Amino acid sequence: LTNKYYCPEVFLDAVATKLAQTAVLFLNVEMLNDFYVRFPREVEAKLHEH
C-alpha cells in the first residue's frame, strides 16, 4: 500500500469500493425499507381509489 502515488488504479478502486459500501448502508436503510413498507400500502390505496 506504500506506493499509493505509483498505483493510481488500485488506490482509486479502493476509495470507490469503500464509498460504495458506506453509502450503501445508508441507502438500504433510508430508501429500501422505505419502499418495502410504503409500496404495498400505496399500491392498495391507489388501486382502490382508482
Partner: protein, 50 residues
Amino acid sequence: KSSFAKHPSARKVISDAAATVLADRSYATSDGIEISLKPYKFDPDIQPNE
C-alpha cells in the same frame, strides 16, 4: 410477468405508485449519503486488506 400484463390502467397505477414512493424518498437518501460520506471525503484511509 404478473397478472397485470393486461389492464394497462391498473398496471400504470402500480408503476406510478412505485415511482412516487421512490421520488418522495429520493432527497433524504441523497443528502443523507453525502453527510455520512463527509468523514471519508477528508481521509479515505486505506487498509492493506482494502
